[PDB]
Design a binder for these strands. Structure first.
Ligand SMILES: [Zn+2]
Length: 834
RNA sequence: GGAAAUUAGGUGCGCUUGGCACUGGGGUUCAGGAAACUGAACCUCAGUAAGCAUUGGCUCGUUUCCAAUGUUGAUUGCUCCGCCGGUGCGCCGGC
DNA sequence: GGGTAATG
DNA sequence: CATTACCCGCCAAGCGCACCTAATTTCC
C-alpha cells in the first residue's frame, strides 16, 4: 500500500502494546491502522502454582529425571552381568527371610574371611547389589578412577558415626565401615536416621575396599568393581552443543579460554592497547614465565608438580598437548578418534591410582572468547607484523562493522523474552505485507534487554528501507484526557491502555525525548509546538476507537496436544472389589480401565440406571483375561477423572486439551452441553485433527461428561457445533444471564460483552473473565465483586444457560487483530454458538 | 552508543548424580485383640508421567495384548491437512 | 492459578 | 442454577553454555 505510517511498541512485563497509525506526509496522524494489546503467559507452566517456572524449565527437569531412571536401570543390569561373569549368583533379597540381610552381610564381609568359595561369592553379590542402590554422591565430572584410593571420611560420615555413638552408647570411632555401624542398631531412611544422608561415594568405596581386604581381593578386582558400582555418565561435553559462534567467521565455534590460541591472543591484545620492534620481545617474556596477563594454562599445568604429567608436556608436540587441554577441561568431549586424543586417552589408563585424585585438584581457566580459534590465531599473526587497528585489515571489514543480528523472531533462550520477540516479528511481518515498511519504529520500556535486542534486530531488518528505530527509558516514556474503564487519562485496570501507550510512543521526536525526561533549546521549543499539534490530532482518533471499541486485546492459543504434565503427581491406593459385588452405574464409571468398563457395561444384567446387581455367577473377560466372581477388580475411589498408574491411580487434573460444544435436540427444547476432552484420550490420534477425533464412550472424557450429553450421543441427538480452547475470546450478551456479582461489576464498570475463556470449571460450567481487564487495576476503594469476577475465580456460567440466552460468538483474529471469518489455510475461525 | 580483553555480580537454562515423598511386591518386629484378624512402625526390591517409534512375538485385540531396545515424551501458543518461505525426509517460520 | 467435591 | 472450601509432591550437589548490569585500558 502507498500509505505511510509510524509504529509504536510498548513492552510490558506480561503485555506488548502494538500500534501503527497512518501518518501524513508532514507528520500528522490520519487513520489508526492497528491497535493491539497483546497478552502473553510469559512462557510459564500453568501447573507450577505461579512460582515463576517456565515450561522450558519444567520440561528439562522431567527430561533429565526421565533419563536418570533409565541410566539407573542400565547400571543394575550391567552389575548383574558383571557378577555372573565372576561365577557369582544373582540372588533376590526376597528369597531370604531376614529383611535386614544385606546390612548384616555388609558388616560380616568387612570383619572376617568367609571360608566357602560358594558362600563368599553369594554374600559378595548380595552386598555389592545393595551398595549400588544407595551409593552416595560424588562430583559428576570426577571419574570413577578418583575412587581407586578413596578419600578420608566425609563430614557426614563423621556426623553419623558420632550419632550412633550417642544412641547405641557403645561406640567404635575407628576403622568402621558404613555397614557395620548400622548393623548394631537393630529408622535409617528419612529425615531422622541418616540425618539427611549427605554421604559421599568415597565413604562407600572405603567400605568396599575393606571388604576386599578381608576376602583376599587384590586391587586388580577392587578397581574393576568400583568401575561398575559407581558407574555414571559424565557431563563433560554437555555444554559443547550450545556454544556460540564467531561473528567474523560464522561457521566456526567460539574460541575456548585456556587454549594456546586465546592465551597467546590475550596478551597480544593488551600490548596493542608503540615500539613496533619490541612488541614481540615483551610478548616472549609474557608468554613463558589489575595485573598483566600470561599464558595461564601452561603456568597452571607445570606448577602442579604432577611428575607423570610434566614429562608428557615437554615431550608432546604443540598439537598433541592441545588435545590434553581439551581432555582436562570440563567443557569438551573426549574423542578417542584422532591419534592425538587417543594418545592422551591411552596415557589416561597407565597412571597410578594416586595420580587420578591429583588431576581433579588442578584447575584450568574456564570461559569462551568472542571469536574462533582460526580467527584467534590469524589476528595474532597479523598483530605481530603490526604495532581494532590490528584487527581491521584481516577481514576487509568496513570500520563501522558491527556483528549482525538474527531475524526478529529468533529465540534467545528466555521463554518470556521469546514470547515478545516472536510476537513482534509476526505483527510487523503482517503489517509490512499490508502497508509496506513503516517510517519510524519507536520502542519503550532485565526486561530492557528485550527492548535493546528489538531495536538492533528491527534496525537490521528494515535497513534496506531506511527506517529509524529508537528506544527510550520507561521513566522518560511515561511523561491524557482519555476515558477508560476505571478512570480518566491513566488506567491500570483497562488492558487497552497498552496499545494506547504504544500509539503515543510512535510520535516521540528525539528533541522531544530530551525535554520529556527533563521535565520529570530554541529548536527544541520549535519541536514542542509541532508535537502538540500532532498529539491533539492523535487524541481525537483514539477516543473514537475507544468509543467504538476498536482497540483489540488478544492472546495466542495453544492447539497442540502436549501441554505440560498430563496428570497429577500424587498416587493413591486403588479400591479393590470382588466381581460378585453389586455395582451401580456410578461404581462402573469408576473402573480403572476402559476394557473393564466395556466388560461391565456389555453384561446382560446391566441396567442403565441400576447398573449391575450382585451376582456370584457373573463372568467377565478383560483383554482375553477371564475374571471370576471371586476375584478383585480395581475401581477408582473418587469420582474424579483418573488413570490406573504404577499400581495405584492418579487424578487427571486440569489436563484438558480442548472442549467441544454440542446442541442437544431432545424435543423438549434445544439445550447446549459441553465435552471436556482430556489430553490422554487424544494420544493414539496425535497425527490427526484433534478436534475431529471420535471419542468412544469408554474414554474418561466421556464418562466424566454431563450425563445428559452422554445419553444424547448414544442416540444421535447431540450436534457437534465447535470446539473451545483456553484463551479463546467470546462475545456474550450479559443482559439476561449475568449473575448478581457480574451485574455489580457491570453497573460500576459498564456492560461487559467481551469475555475470555480461562478454564473449563465443571462438566457443565465455564470459567470466564473480562477480556479487557487486569487484576492490578483493582484498588482498595473498589468493590469486592471485582475481585471475584476479575481475579478469582471469575464468572462461572452454566454452559446451557450461557449458550441458550447469551447469544455467544467465538472470535478468532489474525496477527493484526482483525476478525477472521473464513480461512483458506484451515486456521481457527470465528463462529456463532446457535 | 557499540566492540575486545579484564575484575565484581546477576539471570536463564544445560548435563550428570544424590536424598526423600507416593504407589506396588516382599519380609521382620510391634500395638490391640481369645482367635480369626486389623492397624502402625521399619527394612527390602520395583515403578516413578500417560505414552510414541523400531524389531520380534501372541489368543492378532474398536475391551488394541506381551517382550526387548531407543526416546528429542513436557521449550518453540493457529493441532491435523494443505500452500509458500527459509534451512539440515526433518526442523523452524508465514497464512 | 487450576480443578474437584460439596454446599446453597 | 450458583457459590464456596480445599486440594495440588519436595530438597540438595558441581559444573558450563548463553545473556545482562557496573567499572578500567585501547579503537571504531
Ligand atoms: Zn469365562
Amino acid at each position: 500500500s502507498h500509505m505511510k505510517y509510524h509504529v509504536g511498541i510498548d513492552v510490558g512485563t506480561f503485555s506488548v502494546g502494538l500500534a501503527a497509525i497512518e501518518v501524513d506526509d508532514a507528520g500528522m496522524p490520519i487513520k489508526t491502522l492497528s491497535l493491539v494489546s497483546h497478552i502473553h503467559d510469559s512462557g510459564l507452566d500453568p501447573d507450577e502454582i505461579k512460582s515463576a517456572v517456565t515450561r522450558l524449565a519444567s520440561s528439562g527437569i522431567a527430561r533429565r529425571t526421565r533419563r536418570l531412571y533409565r541410566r539407573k536401570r542400565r547400571r543394575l543390569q550391567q552389575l548383574d552381568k558383571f557378577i555372573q561373569r565372576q561365577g557369582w549368583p544373582v540372588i533376590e533379597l526376597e528369597d531370604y527371610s531376614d529383611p535386614l540381610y544385606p546390612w548384616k552381610v555388609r558388616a560380616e564381609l568387612a570383619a572376617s574371611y568367609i571360608a566357602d568359595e560358594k558362600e563368599r561369592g553369594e554374600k559378595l553379590s548380595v552386598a555389592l547389589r545393595h551398595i549400588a542402590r544407595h551409593r552416595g554422591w560424588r562430583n559428576p565430572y570426577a571419574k570413577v578412577s578418583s575412587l581407586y584410593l578413596p578419600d578420608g571420611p566425609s563430614d557426614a560420615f563423621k556426623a553419623i558415626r558420632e550419632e550412633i555413638k550417642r544412641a547405641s552408647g557403645q561406640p567404635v570411632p575407628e576403622t568402621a565401615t558404613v555397614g557395620q555401624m548400622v548393623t548394631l542398631c537393630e529408622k535409617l531412611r528419612g529425615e531422622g536416621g541418616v540425618l539427611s544422608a549427605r554421604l559421599q561415594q568415597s565413604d562407600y568405596a572405603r567400605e568396599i575396599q575393606e571388604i576386599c581386604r578381608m576376602q583376599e581381593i587384590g586391587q586388580e578386582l577392587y578397581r574393576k568393581i568400583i568401575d561398575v558400582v559407581f558407574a555414571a555418565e559424565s557431563p563433560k561435553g554437555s555444554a559443547s552443543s550450545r556454544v556460540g559462534k564467531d561473528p567474523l567467521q560464522p561457521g566456526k565455534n567460539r574460541a575456548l579460554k585456556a587454549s594456546d590460541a586465546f592465551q597467546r591472543y590475550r596478551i597480544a591484545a593488551l600490548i596493542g592497547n608503540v615500539e613496533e620492534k619490541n612488541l614481540v620481545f615483551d610478548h616472549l617474556v609474557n608468554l613463558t614465565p589489575a595485573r598483566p596477563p600470561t599464558h595461564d594454562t601452561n603456568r597452571s599445568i607445570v606448577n602442579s608438580r604432577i611428575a607423570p604429567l610434566v614429562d608428557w608436556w615437554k615431550t608432546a608436540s604443540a598439537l598433541e598437548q592441545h588435545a590434553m587441554v581439551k581432555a582436562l577441561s570440563n567443557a569438551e568431549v573426549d574423542d578417542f578418534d584422532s591419534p592425538e586424543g587417543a594418545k592422551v586417552q591411552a596415557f589416561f589408563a597407565d597412571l597410578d591410582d594416586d595420580v587420578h585424585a591429583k588431576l581433579d585438584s588442578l584447575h584450568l581457566p574456564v570461559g569462551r572468547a568472542a571469536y574462533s580459534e582460526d580467527t584467534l590465531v590469524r589476528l595474532t599473526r597479523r598483530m605481530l607484523s603490526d604495532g581494532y587497528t590490528a584487527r581491521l585489515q584481516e577481514f576487509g571489514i568496513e570500520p563501522s562493522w558491527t556483528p549482525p543480528t538474527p531475524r526478529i523472531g529468533e529465540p534467545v533462550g528466555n521463554p518470556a523474552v521469546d514470547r515478545v520477540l516472536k510476537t513482534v516479528s509476526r505483527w510487523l511481518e503482517s503489517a509490512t505485507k499490508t502497508w509496506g515498511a513503516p517510517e519510524r519504529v519507536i520502542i519503550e520500556h532485565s526486561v530492557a534487554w528485550m527492548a535493546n535486542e528489538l531495536r538492533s534486530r528491527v534496525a537490521q531488518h528494515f535497513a534496506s528501507h531506511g527506517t529509524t528505530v529508537r528506544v527510550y527509558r520507561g521513566s522518560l516514556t511515561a511523561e491524557g484526557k482519555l476515558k477508560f474503564f476505571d478512570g480518566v487519562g491513566k488506567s491500570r485496570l483497562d488492558r487497552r491502555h497498552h496499545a494506547i501507550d504504544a500509539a503515543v510512543i510512535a510520535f516521540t521526536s528525539d528533541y522531544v525525548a530530551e525535554t520529556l525526561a527533563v521535565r520529570s533549546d530554541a529548536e527544541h521549543r520549535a519541536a514542542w509546538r509541532v508535537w502538540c499539534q500532532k498529539m491533539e490530532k492523535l487524541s481525537a482518533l483514539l477516543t473514537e476507537d475507544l468509543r467504538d471499541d476498536r482497540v483489540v486485546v488478544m492472546s495466542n492459543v495453544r492447539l497442540r496436544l502436549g501441554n505440560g504434565s498430563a496428570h497429577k503427581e500424587t498416587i493413591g491406593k486403588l479400591s479393590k472389589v470382588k466381581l460378585s459385588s453389586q455395582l451401580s452405574v456410578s461404581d462402573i464409571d469408576k473402573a480403572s480401565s476402559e476394557a473393564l468398563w466395556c466388560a461391565l457395561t456389555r453384561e446382560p444384567g446391566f441396567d442403565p440406571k441400576e447398573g449391575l446387581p450382585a451376582n456370584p455367577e457373573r463372568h467377565i473377560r478383560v483383554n482375553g483375561t477371564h475374571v471370576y466372581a471371586g476375584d478383585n477388580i480395581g475401581l477408582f475411589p473418587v469420582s474424579a477423572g483418573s488413570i490406573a498408574l504404577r499400581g495405584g491411580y492418579a487424578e487427571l487434573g486440569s489436563s484438558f486439551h480442548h472442549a467441544r460444544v454440542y446442541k442437544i435436540t431432545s424435543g423438549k427444547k434445544p439445550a447446549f452441553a459441553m465435552l471436556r476432552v482430556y489430553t490422554i484420550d487424544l494420544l493414539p490420534y496425535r497425527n490427526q485433527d484433534l478436534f475431529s477425533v471420535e471419542l468412544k464412550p469408554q474414554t474418561m472424557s466421556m464418562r466424566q461428561a454431563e450425563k445428559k450429553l452422554r445419553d444424547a450421543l448414544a442416540t444421535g441427538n447431540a450436534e457437534y457445533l465447535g470446539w473451545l480452547v483456553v484463551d479463546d475470546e467470546l462475545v456474550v450478551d450479559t443482559s439476561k444471564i449475568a449473575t448478581d456479582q457480574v451485574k455489580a461489576v457491570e453497573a460500576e464498570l459498564g456492560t461487559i460483552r467481551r469475555w475470555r475463556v480461562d478454564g473449563f470449571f465443571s462438566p457443565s460450567k465455564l470459567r470466564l473473565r473480562p477480556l479487557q481487564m487486569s487484576k492490578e487495576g483493582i484498588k482498595k476503594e473498589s468493590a469486592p465483586e471485582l475481585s471475584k469476577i476479575i481475579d478469582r475465580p471469575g464468572w462461572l456460567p452454566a454452559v446451557n444457560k450461557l449458550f441458550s440466552d447469551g447469544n455467544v460468538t467465538v472470535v478468532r483474529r489474525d496477527s493484526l487483530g482483525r476478525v477472521r471469518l473464513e480461512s483458506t489455510a484451515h486456521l481457527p475461525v470465528t463462529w456463532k454458538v446457535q
